[PDB]
Every structure is written in structure tokens, then in C-alpha cells.
Design a protein around this ligand. Structure first.
Ligand SMILES: Nc1ncnc2c1ncn2[C@@H]1O[C@H](COP(=O)(O)OP(=O)(O)O)[C@@H](O)[C@H]1O
Ligand SMILES: Nc1ncnc2c1ncn2[C@@H]1O[C@H](COP(=O)(O)OP(=O)(O)O)[C@@H](O)[C@H]1O
Ligand SMILES: [Mg+2]
Ligand SMILES: [Mg+2]
Lengths: 372, 139, 743, 7
């Protein structure tokens, strides 16, 4: 036998497991910590860096970098550290035995593929490798072959329409509004209620607020008036030290920035109007089958109400006769991984892999030509 | 054949005339040839007879003068011994096997014909001394 | 060349595949003519030649001097019809032809006569191969397998039973048969099914070990099963039933116990309904379980467990009737109440709300978390039918374990002898995943047969110190690889079961894309995308892609099985499961695995072989149809064996028997008075070239024609000597009779 | 990135 490895280099969470599994065997944040403070106790064990879940525990004493920003890998040594931790510590597998499948956003700089491949063959000596678009995997994950895939992570949002397995590249739209730049806005709006969050390890505390408390307003202005009218929306949270904090109409105001990028100060339209303006680029024949098969993917899609706000507000754009349908399975955060576990297990896929000999012959230019 | 031979043969032929017309049947021709020392097969007899049909073989009658050329034509030990040694190497031949082959192979004979030729020559085991029996049947 | 006036040849005919002619004028190099009552026989870029009678009666198909389909078929037919003998030998392989009437021959004096003798000395009988096994196992420690094979009617179970009667009778006392034979009413009930071309058909692969004491006596028996056709439990073709036990059970329902199980009529249940054939003429299913339960009791399956088994089968029957309604394109539900689910849950003692929930949803968890998906109506129906198939398979493996418990004994077995009953290669004029599996298994079994026969002939050559290079065989590994290998037919089917939307149309189109021109052995039918053709060793066979996938698929959700394994109402249902990734595996991969385990079971033994041919479709006693028998003899590789043995040296003769037959040809001067050298001296006179005949330590090896030639010259010499003897005797007898009577 | 954005 052999089993492929499946790895997804999200901006925020690494997800990894063996192909053919239905759930990732490791998840940990793609976070690298270095000691912040002068080390006093001689005889303490001083690890030069902490990676992943370790850095969660010790965050109070660390500066936490993320090596991925807006789906560009920004400094490659720490990325290598993350993959080293992943294969040796999380999966406990030698990559030299096991082929590996990797995942990327659709438009990100072309150099990124060359370098990511080079590291796999030169550093880890993987038997074979591949790179897949997230929006492609989400269709395998949702069990359908015609889709417009709306996928939003920590670092990137992107739309890709697929019809009968033909991707449609001109159709494709990308925004840099994502979980991270929700979090940063959440700091600035929490400051309105007189709470201050200045530091990276503390930013994670903000992120945990955003994950627990936030939700999407089904009418933004009507609930804003309702929250001005009454306490009833306002709700209570705990810091790590046990200070309780209470959070009002503002907790929806971050998910609202998805639908109004003007708040953060983006140029663009929000996710629904770019989804529509993507479909409008498509050939009129297909559009009826895109409007049914909306698939939402990636963890930023997880807020309650975002399905119903998406369906309502896109219905305002689309002509009345075509029924809009939106499909938001409760596990979609994984779904890019689940669909990569599906893809890496196909017998037809086995011919696709970029192999060691063929890479040595070509050099990393091959990753553009063969892989897509 | 000389005149004396022709006279002896004619006398013998007349002894074989069972109808009184001074003739024998075609079917008796073989018997007459055998009585005069020839040993033709029934097939050879029919061949020298001209492959006669059943009717003339049983009822057409010929005098000595027409019979004679056929007798002449027919007239003009180690194989016999080996032939008997086929059915043997102690100098014997089963009586049962000779009876079976003579009544079931070749120009098959009746069990009574075989008993007649075999009468007094087989012992209690049913074995025939074939050199003595052969000399006897060749005499 | 030889063809003369009053020779014989075989000519083809639609109505009987070969019929005989005499030759009307000698052949010279064009068209021939024949007598039967004449037509010129067309020749195209020769006819066969027909053996002399003296061979054709005989016991061994290698003894025939011309080897070809007409001679073999005619020999088997004269043996069956005229001689009233069924057993015959071909190469090493015994062949058996169903007499469908019962014969004294199995009496115990026959058994004693066979005991301690060989293949050649005694007339072919099923006992003779058992004696071969019993002798082999005393030559060598090696365990012996006996393999019985043929289309469903042919007689395989009954032939196994006689092989067991033989071993037990020769063994002396130590009492296995009573138990083993009493098991069969159980096994036939759970494991046999009714199919379009006959009424009782074993849909699994069935194995017995007889164990022996260090000094040979039967100590006990142990039973195994392989290749169970799980799909039949939920999906049935036209006019074809699932396993008899469901019908026996339904026809029982008026009995007092089964009322508790609330069994409807036999057609009522969705798994019985599908065949549209709820009754077999002449078999009163309601009576047959009285035998089945008698056999269980006689075997010691407790009166409690019998009711547990029937409770579980009722469980599956009720389960199958249970039908979802789509809430949505994305999800379904069981309706606000669905009656038969209640009956399922109260048979097996589980909360209706728990089965209702877990049937409708599935659970998926990364261990920090857990998530529940609603699932499509289709995937819910696939899950239900996989839970049905998984229960049935586990029940069958339990019934076979409790059977085996009664059959073992604890004293260490020295060596087993093993007897195998499996379906033979089979072609039906609609073909489906069940036949694809059955043919693939008959590939594996015949590869093993071919390689074994090739080995035995290499042995026999070296045992007679003769050159070897001629030895040849048919290699079916390139056809097996088409079914088995990666991007094979099975592997693309299992792929498409994954692929997010997958259909018997896209699977076929994938087959054509990858395979279509890349092998000879795969072919498309001219007028359909939906079907494809595989050139198996017996035949080109054509399969329909429709409904492979729905048969292909098992996935047994951990939640539903957990819920069953929870229940406390009765012992057996938790007992089945107690013993994973295997829940994921499709039926085809489980089948491949079980077949590998079967080939691991049969390899590291030495086979002996039986073939069983069904003489006629219509159950007519002790009569025969050439048109079927040819189709059987091709599917059994008998024709392949015979052809390949004819291409080389077919015929074996001991110098002792050669001299014993052909001293008639000898001359006493030519008798050197030791047989081997005498015949080595004689033979060169009679046959031109040593390429056409050979000499070994004990055996002469002829090429095919030469036996008939020798028999002819023997006849000629016999006639010549007889005519000489008769002519001389007639001459002096005639003299004696007319002269002595006239005297 | 390299231009229009910080990465
Ligand atoms: N229950 C939740 N509600 C809202 N957001 C969530 C929830 N759980 C996780 N998230 C957000 O999901 C984002 C990570 O999404 P993910 O798809 O895993 O990114 P990537 O796959 O690119 O690593 C983070 O911003 C995290 O805060
Ligand atoms: N050698 C035989 N002697 C007598 N009857 C036989 C013989 N072989 C088959 N039969 C009859 O034909 C039937 C069909 O054969 P059977 O062994 O029952 O089928 P299967 O091949 O499914 O085991 C037997 O039950 C028996 O009635
Ligand atoms: Mg992602
Ligand atoms: Mg049977």
C-alpha cells in the first residue's frame, strides 16, 4: 500500500491527516513564538522557538508571528519549522516514504508555488507532490460537480465558479477581507467600549471573542436600532484573568464588514455583490445552475446568520425567477481538507503527481505547467 | 494336366455330381478344388468363378470342361507355423481362442466346423499341440 | 495425410455439434464428399479424423489416439448413454456427468475394493481421487486439497458428500459424517439462492477440513466459507430470489412463535419482493425449515439461539421496508411516524428515536470536536442497505462459527485433507456484478489449475528423463491484471463510488477512455455505451454497467452499528459484532480480499480435481445434450487441457503392456525375450521418425496418431493369419466331410 | 505581496 499525506496551508490553521481519512488527524494554528523576555532561571529548558499548539500555552511570554499573510508565505524558515513540526511531531511520519498534497489560493504570487515545491523536494524529499485550489476541493467535499465556491479563511476570500468540472478562470474574484482583518477591526471597535488589546498573544484573546460572540445581523439597521433600544443584545465574556467584559451591538458589527467593506475602508464590494458580479461574468447558459449550487467554505463563513444574510441579500441582486439556493454544511471549515482527502485517494489522481525524477529533470518551473 | 490326371479328375467330379446331369454347382466348385488338393479361400473361389450371383451360384450347373480352367488357374510351412504361433511359446494353442477366432474373424466358420477339424486333437486343458495338429491338417 | 474410402470423419452440425461420416473417395490434394446421404463437404483454409472403436470405449481421454472436441464428446456420450458409467479421467482431472439417478456403485464392497490401489489399476470413480489424496498424504506430510467445480446443477455437494463417506468408511471408527451431513441443511438454507437458470444455487465458497491423527484416523472436521455474495441480500434480478432462509421464514409466519416477529406475507417485504417469484414449484418452503431447525438442534445450536437467528432475520426484513421522505434537496427524514421501524426497534430493543435519528444523519468528528451532517435521501438508502448487508454477513459468520464448535476436537490434528465446493465459470445472457466476481474468481482458480498441471507434467518428464522444451500452457495473468490491477475495471468502479457524482454511464465512459484500445481483452459492444466485453479464458462475455454502483457500495455508519451493539434485549445481536476501516470498504474490495485468502488457503496444499457437467437443462434422467456439454467442457478448461496435451505427446504406454498387446506383430526370431529392448528393437520398422515417438525408462510416449496406426496394422496381420488358417482348415474339412460321408 | 498589500 501507500497513503498520501494531505496538508492545507491556511493562513491561520494548519490541517493535516492521511488521505482516505474523513477528518484531519492534526489541527494547530500556524503560529510561531519566540521568547520575549530575559531568561532568568538557569536550568530552565530554553527552546529557541515554539510552534503551533505549544505557542498557545506560553503566549504570555512570547511574540507570536504568523508566517502566512493573505495567503502569501512571508518568511520561509518559520514555514519550514511549521511543516517540520507537522510531519515529525503531529503526524509522526517520515515524508520521504509518503507523497504529499498541498493547497493554495487561486491568484497568489507565482513564486510561491516554485518555492513551496523546492522546499518539499530539497528539504523533505517527498516522493511526489501536488497543489490544489481550495475552491476546487470544496466541491469534492460537498459532493457536487457544478458550483460557485465562496471560500474565506484567515487570510483570503475568493470566488471560483465551476461547471461540470470546467473551472472558468476569468470568472474568478479575490478579496483580502478575512478572519484576521475582522479581528483587527474588532480591536478598534472594542476600544469604543473602553477595552484595549495591543499585543499579539492578546490578539488571540480577541479572536476567541470573535469566535464565541459574533453573529450576522439579518437586518443591520433594524438590529442596530433594537440594540440602541435595549440591553437585550448585550452579552458577557471573560478574559483569561477573570475580568468579565460585556459586549453589545458591536459584536455583530464585525460580521457586517464582510457585507460592507467600506467600514474597514476597502475599495471593493462585499462578498455577496462580488459573488453576483462573478456569476454575471459567466456564460448565461450556466448561470441557472450556479444560482442553485452556492457552496460556502472556510471558517470565516461560520458565523450564524451569514447563510440567511447571503441568501436574502443576493436575492436582491438576482432576477426574481431564478431561485437562489445556498448550501452551508456544518463542517465546511474542514471541507477543503475533506475534499483533498477525497481527491488524493482517486486512482485517476495517481498519474497526476509531480514525481521526484520529473522535478529533477524540469526544475520547479514544472509546477506551473503540470500542476495547475 | 495330362490325360490320366484329367480322367482321375473327371471321375472325382462325377462322384460329386449330386443331381445326375454330369455337372456340379458353382457353389460346389470350391469343394471340388479342395478335394483335388487345392486350398483356395471362398473369396478366391468366387473370384475364379467370376463373382457369380447368388442365383447362378446355387442353381447354374457346369460340366467338368468349364470347371477345369478355374481349377487350373487356382493350381497355378513356416508362414503357416508362425500364423498358428500368433495365437500361442510352449508349442500349444488354446482351443477356446482358436474357436473364437475361426468363428469371429476372417471368413467366419460355424462352431461345428471348428469342432470337426479340432475333434480329438485338443487335450483336457483345451490346448492344441500346433506342430502335430498342423502336420495333421496339412497331410 | 490419411483419408480413405470407409474411413470416418466428424462434420459440424447445428443440432449436434459433431456428427460422423464415412469417406466416399480417397483424399488427394479439392472438395471432399462423405456418407452418413451425400453432400460435398466444403473445405477452407481440414476435417477431424475419428478414432477406431477399440479406443473410444476406454476409460481415459488421453487413451484416445485423436484428441479433439468431437472425439472427446462422443466418448463421454457413449460412456454415459450406452455403458451407464459417469466417471471418466482427463489428464489428471476427473470428470463427472450428472446421472440424476442413483446407482449401486457406492456400496461398501466397492469402497473396500478401491482401498489401497491407484489411478490406473481401477476404473475411474470419485472414490479413486479420495484414495489418491489418502495415499499422497501418507507419501508426504503435505496437506491435500480436493476441488469440485461446475455449474450449479452439476452435483458438487453430492460429490463432496461421497468423498467424505469414503474417507470416514476407510478411516475406521474414532463420528464425523453424521454432524457434517447434518450441517448441510443449515448451510444450504443460509447460503443458497434461486436464480434464473436453476432453483438451488450456492452463492458462497465452501470448504471442509478433515483432520487426521498422527496415525491416520479421522479426528474431526472444520469448516470455512469464502466469497459470500453479500449483494443478494438487498438487490435481486428478475425472476431471482434471495437466500432461501428468508422465504422459509416468511412461509413459517403462521407458526406460533413467529407471530411475535409480525412477519407479513412472502412478497410483502422489499427484499423478498424484488424477484417477483415468491414460490418454487415442488419445494414447500414452509416445510423445509422443519428440516433446517431439526439440523440446528441435531448440531446443538440452542433452542434459544434459533429464535435469536430468526429474530435477526426478521429484523433485516423489517428494516428493508423503511422509507425516507425528502425534507429538502439537501436532506431527508423518516416521516412523522414510519410503522415498520417500530417493529424493527421492538424486535431488537432499541429506542425508536435513536434509530430514527442515526438513520437520517451521520456523525463526523475530529477528536477536539464533533459535527453532524444531514445526508441525502440516496445516501441514507445506501446506508440502510449496507447495514442490512453487514448484519447478514456477520450473522452468517456466527452461524458458521457455532457450526464449527460442534465439529472440532481438541486433539492436535496431524494433517488435514480439504474438500472444496465452488461455483464454476458461468455465462448468462444478462450479466451483472455477481457474475463479474464469479468469473474473476474462476480466473484465479484456473490460473492455479494451469500452473499445477504444468508443474506435474514437468515432474513427469523429468521422472522419465526426456527433454522438456515443448511443455506449454495458457497464461491468463494478462486477463486477471485487467480486472485486478490499478486502473483496472474494479479499481475504477471503486474510484467512481468516491467521485462526487458517479453513475453507470460515467463509469463505462471511463472504462472506454482508459482500456478501450490499450488491451485486446477489453472490447466495447458495437451498439451500446452501457455495456462492455471481457475475453475470459472460456469465452468473450459481456456485462451491463447498469446497477454496478448500487451493488458496489457498502459503508456502514459507526453510529447505527453502535446503536445495535448497545442493545440488551437478547444475547445474540451484541454477540455478532464483538470481534473500523473495513466498514469503508466496498463489496468489490472485500471480495478481492476474500479471494486472496482463498488462494492462500489452497496454495500450500496440493490439489486434486473433479469437474461436474450438467447434462441437460430439463432434469431429464440419465440423458444428455451435446450442446450444453460442450459449453460446460469449454468453461472447465477441459478442452484447453486436451488440445494442449494433443499438441505434444498425449499417449503413455508401458513396455509390458505394449508387448502384451502387440506380440501378435512379433516374430519369435525377433523376440529378444525382454520386453523393453524387444520393442525398442521392433518399433523402428513400423513408424518413420523418432520425432513422432519416444522412449523412456518405463514408458513409450507416442504422438497422437500412432496408436490407431498400430491398431490397424495389428488388425491386418490378425486377418491375414486367420484367413490362412481358415482357408487350409476349410480345404481339408471339405475333403473330410464329403469324402468320409460318401465313403 | 509585493505591492498593493503588506504581504
Ligand atoms: N464558530 C466560529 N464562528 C466564527 N468564526 C470562526 C469559528 N470558528 C473558527 N472561526 C474562524 O475561522 C477562521 C479560520 O478559518 P479557516 O478556514 O480555518 O482558515 P484557513 O483554512 O485559511 O486556515 C479564524 O478567523 C477563526 O476565528
Ligand atoms: N453422482 C450422483 N448420483 C446421484 N444423483 C446425483 C449425482 N449428482 C447429482 N445428483 C442429483 O442431482 C442433484 C443436483 O446436484 P446437487 O449436488 O444437489 O447440486 P449442487 O451442485 O448445487 O450441489 C442432486 O441433489 C441429486 O439429486
Ligand atoms: Mg482555508
Ligand atoms: Mg450444492
Amino acid at each position: 500500500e501507500t497513503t498520501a499525506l494531505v496538508c492545507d496551508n491556511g493562513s491561520g490553521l494548519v490541517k493535516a491527516g492521511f488521505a482516505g481519512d474523513d477528518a484531519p488527524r492534526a489541527v494547530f494554528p500556524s503560529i510561531v513564538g519566540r521568547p520575549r523576555h530575559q531568561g532568568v532561571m538557569v536550568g530552565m529548558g530554553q527552546k529557541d522557538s515554539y510552534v503551533g499548539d505549544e505557542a498557545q500555552s506560553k503566549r504570555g511570554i512570547l511574540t507570536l508571528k504568523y508566517p502566512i499573510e493573505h495567503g502569501i508565505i512571508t518568511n520561509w524558515d518559520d514555514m519550514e519549522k511549521i511543516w517540520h513540526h507537522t510531519f515529525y511531531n503531529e503526524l509522526r511520519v517520515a515524508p520521504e516514504e509518503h507523497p504529499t498534497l498541498l493547497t493554495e489560493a487561486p491568484l497568489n504570487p507565482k513564486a510561491n508555488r516554485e518555492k513551496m515545491t523546492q522546499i518539499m523536494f530539497e528539504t523533505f524529499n517527498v516522493p511526489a507532490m501536488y497543489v490544489a485550489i481550495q475552491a476546487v476541493l470544496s466541491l469534492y467535499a460537498s459532493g457536487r460537480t457544478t458550483g460557485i465556491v465562496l471560500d474565506s479563511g484567515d487570510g483570503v476570500t475568493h470566488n471560483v465558479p465551476i461547471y461540470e468540472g470546467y473551472a472558468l478562470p476569468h470568472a474568478i474574484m479575490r478579496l483580502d477581507l478575512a478572519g484576521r482583518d475582522l479581528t483587527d477591526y474588532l480591536m478598534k471597535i472594542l476600544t469604543e467600549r473602553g477595552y484595549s488589546f495591543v499585543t499579539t498573544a492578546e490578539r488571540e484573546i480577541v479572536r476567541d471573542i470573535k469566535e464565541k460572540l459574533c453573529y450576522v445581523a439579518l437586518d443591520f439597521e433594524n438590529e442596530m436600532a433594537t440594540a440602541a433600544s435595549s440591553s437585550s443584545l448585550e452579552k458577557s465574556y471573560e478574559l483569561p484573568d477573570g475580568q468579565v467584559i460585556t459586549i453589545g451591538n458591536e459584536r455583530f458589527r464585525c460580521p457586517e464588514t464582510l457585507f460592507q467593506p467600506s467600514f474597514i475602508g476597502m475599495e471593493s464590494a462585499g462578498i455577496h455583490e462580488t459573488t453576483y458580479n462573478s456569476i454575471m461574468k459567466c456564460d448565461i447558459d450556466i448561470r441557472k445552475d450556479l444560482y442553485a449550487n452556492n457552496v460556502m467554505s472556510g471558517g470565516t463563513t461560520m458565523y450564524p446568520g451569514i447563510a440567511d444574510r447571503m441568501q436574502k441579500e443576493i436575492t436582491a441582486l438576482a432576477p426574481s425567477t431564478m431561485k437562489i439556493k445556498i448550501i452551508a454544511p456544518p463542517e465546511r471549515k474542514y471541507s477543503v481538507w475533506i475534499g483533498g482527502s477525497i481527491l488524493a485517494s482517486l486512482s485517476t489522481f495517481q498519474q497526476m503527481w509531480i514525481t521526484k525524477q520529473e522535478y529533477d529533470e524540469a526544475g520547479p518551473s514544472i509546477v506551473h505547467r503540470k500542476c495547475f | 494336366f495330362n490325360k490320366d490326371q484329367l480322367e482321375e479328375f473327371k471321375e472325382a467330379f462325377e462322384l460329386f455330381d449330386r443331381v445326375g446331369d454330369g455337372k456340379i454347382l458353382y457353389s460346389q466348385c470350391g469343394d471340388v478344388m479342395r478335394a483335388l488338393g487345392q486350398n483356395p479361400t471362398n473369396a478366391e473361389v468366387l473370384k475364379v468363378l467370376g463373382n457369380p450371383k447368388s442365383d447362378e451360384l446355387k442353381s447354374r450347373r457346369v460340366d467338368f470342361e468349364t470347371f477345369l480352367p478355374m481349377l487350373q488357374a487356382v493350381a497355378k510351412y513356416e508362414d503357416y507355423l508362425e500364423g498358428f504361433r500368433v495365437f500361442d511359446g510352449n508349442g500349444k494353442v488354446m482351443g477356446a481362442e482358436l474357436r473364437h477366432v475361426l468363428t469371429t474373424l476372417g471368413e467366419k466358420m460355424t462352431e461345428e466346423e471348428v469342432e470337426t477339424v479340432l475333434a480329438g486333437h485338443e487335450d483336457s486343458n483345451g490346448c492344441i499341440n500346433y506342430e502335430a495338429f498342423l502336420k495333421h491338417i496339412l497331410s | 495425410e490419411l483419408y480413405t474410402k470407409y474411413a470416418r470423419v466428424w462434420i459440424p452440425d447445428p443440432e449436434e455439434v459433431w456428427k460422423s461420416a464415412e469417406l466416399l473417395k480417397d483424399y488427394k490434394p479439392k472438395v471432399l464428399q462423405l456418407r452418413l446421404k451425400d453432400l460435398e463437404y466444403c473445405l477452407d483454409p481440414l476435417p477431424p479424423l475419428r478414432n477406431p472403436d477399440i479406443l473410444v470405449g476406454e476409460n481415459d481421454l488421453t487413451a484416445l489416439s485423436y484428441l479433439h472436441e468431437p472425439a472427446v464428446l462422443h466418448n463421454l456420450k457413449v460412456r454415459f448413454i450406452d455403458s451407464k458409467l459417469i466417471y471418466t479421467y482427463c489428464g489428471i482431472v476427473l470428470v463427472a456427468i450428472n446421472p440424476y439417478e442413483q446407482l449401486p456403485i457406492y456400496g461398501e464392497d466397492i469402497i473396500n475394493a478401491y482401498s489401497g490401489q491407484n489411478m490406473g489399476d481401477m476404473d475411474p470413480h470419485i472414490f479413486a481421487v479420495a484414495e489418491e489424496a489418502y495415499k499422497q498424504m501418507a507419501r508426504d506430510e503435505r496437506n491435500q486439497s480436493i476441488i469440485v467445480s461446475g455449474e450449479s446443477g452439476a452435483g458438487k455437494t453430492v460429490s463432496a458428500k461421497y468423498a467424505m463417506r469414503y474417507f470416514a468408511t476407510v478411516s475406521g471408527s474414532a463420528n464425523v459424517e453424521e454432524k457434517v451431513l447434518a450441517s448441510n441443511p443449515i448451510m444450504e438454507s443460509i447460503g443458497n439462492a434461486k436464480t434464473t437458470r436453476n432453483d438451488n444455487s450456492s452463492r458462497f465458497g465452501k470448504y471442509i477440513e478433515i483432520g487426521f491423527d498422527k496415525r491416520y484416523r479421522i479426528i474431526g472436521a472444520n469448516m470455512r466459507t469464502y466469497l459470500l455474495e453479500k449483494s443478494r441480500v438487498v438487490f435481486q434480478a428478475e425472476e431471482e430470489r434471495n437466500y432461501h432462509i428468508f422465504y422459509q421464514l416468511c412461509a413459517s409466519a403462521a407458526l406460533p412463535e413467529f407471530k411475535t416477529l409480525r412477519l407479513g406475507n412472502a412478497n410483502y417485504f422489499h427484499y423478498t419482493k424484488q424477484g417477483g417469484s415468491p414460490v418454487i414449484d415442488g419445494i414447500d418452503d414452509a416445510k423445509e425449515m422443519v428440516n433446517t431447525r431439526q439440523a440446528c438442534t441435531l448440531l446443538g445450536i440452542s433452542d434459544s439461539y434459533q429464535m435469536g437467528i430468526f429474530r435477526i432475520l426478521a429484523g433485516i426484513l423489517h428494516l428493508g421496508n423503511v422509507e425516507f421522505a425528502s425534507r429538502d434537496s439537501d436532506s431527508c427524514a423518516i416521516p412523522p411516524k414510519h410503522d415498520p421501524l417500530t417493529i424493527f426497534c421492538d424486535l431488537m430493543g432499541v429506542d425508536y428515536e435513536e434509530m430514527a435519528h442515526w438513520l437520517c444523519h451521520r456523525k463526523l468528528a475530529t477528536a477536539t470536536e464533533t459535527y453532524i451532517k444531514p445526508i441525502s435521501k440516496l445516501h441514507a438508502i445506501n446506508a440502510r442497505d449496507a447495514l442490512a448487508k453487514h448484519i447478514y454477513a456477520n450473522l452468517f459468520n456466527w452461524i458458521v462459527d457455532h457450526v464449527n464448535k460442534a465439529l472440532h476436537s481438541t486433539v492436535k490434528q496431524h494433517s488435514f485433507i480439504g474438500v472444496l465446493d465452488i461455483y464454476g465459470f458461468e455465462t448468462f445472457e444478462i450479466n451483472s456484478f455477481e457474475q463479474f466476481c464469479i468469473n474473476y474468481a474462476n480466473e484465479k482458480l484456473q490460473q492455479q489449475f494451469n500452473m499445477h498441471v504444468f508443474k506435474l507434467e514437468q515432474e513427469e518428464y523429468m521422472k522419465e528423463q526426456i527433454p522438456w522444451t515443448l511443455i506449454d500452457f495458457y497464461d491468463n495473468q494478462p486477463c486477471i491484471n485487467l480486472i485486478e490491477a490499478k486502473m483496472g475495471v474494479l479499481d475504477l468502479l471503486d474510484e467512481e463510488c468516491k467521485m462526487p457524482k458517479g453513475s453507470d454511464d460515467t463509469w463505462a465512459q471511463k472504462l472506454y477512455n482508459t482500456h478501450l484500445n490499450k488491451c485486446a481483452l477489453f472490447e466495447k459492444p458495437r451498439l451500446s455505451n452501457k455495456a462492455f466485453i471481457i475475453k475470459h479464458f472460456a469465452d468473450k462475455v459481456e456485462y451491463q454497467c447498469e446497477g454496478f454502483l448500487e451493488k458496489n457500495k457498502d459503508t456502514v455508519y459507526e453510529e447505527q452499528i453502535k446503536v445495535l451493539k448497545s442493545s440488551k434485549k437478547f444475547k445474540l445481536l451484541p454477540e455478532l459484532f464483538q470481534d473500523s476501516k473495513e466498514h469503508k470498504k466496498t463489496v468489490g474490495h472485500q471480495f478481492r480480499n476474500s479471494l486472496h485468502l482463498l488462494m492462500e488457503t489452497l496454495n500450500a496444499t496440493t490439489p486434486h480435481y473433479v469437474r461436474c457437467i450438467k447434462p441437460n437443462d430439463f432434469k431429464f434422467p440419465f440423458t444428455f445434450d451435446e450442446k450444453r456439454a460442450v459449453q460446460q467442457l469449454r468453461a472447465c478448461g477441459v478442452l484447453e487441457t486436451i488440445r494442449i496435451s494433443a499438441a505434444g505427446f498425449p499417449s503413455r504406454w508401458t513396455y509390458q503392456e505394449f508387448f502384451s498387446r502387440y506380440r501378435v506383430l512379433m516374430k519369435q526370431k525377433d523376440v529378444l525375450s525382454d520386453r523393453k529392448q524387444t520393442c525398442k528393437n521392433v518399433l523402428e520398422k513400423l513408424i518413420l521418425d523418432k520425432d513422432k515417438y519416444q522412449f523412456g525408462k518405463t514408458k513409450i510416449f507416442f504422438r497422437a496418431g500412432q496408436v490407431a496406426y498400430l491398431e490397424k496394422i495389428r488388425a491386418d496381420k490378425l486377418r491375414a493369419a486367420c484367413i490362412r488358417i481358415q482357408k487350409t482348415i476349410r480345404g481339408w474339412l471339405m475333403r473330410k466331410k464329403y469324402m468320409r460321408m460318401r465313403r | 505581496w509585493x505591492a498593493x498589500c503588506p504581504a
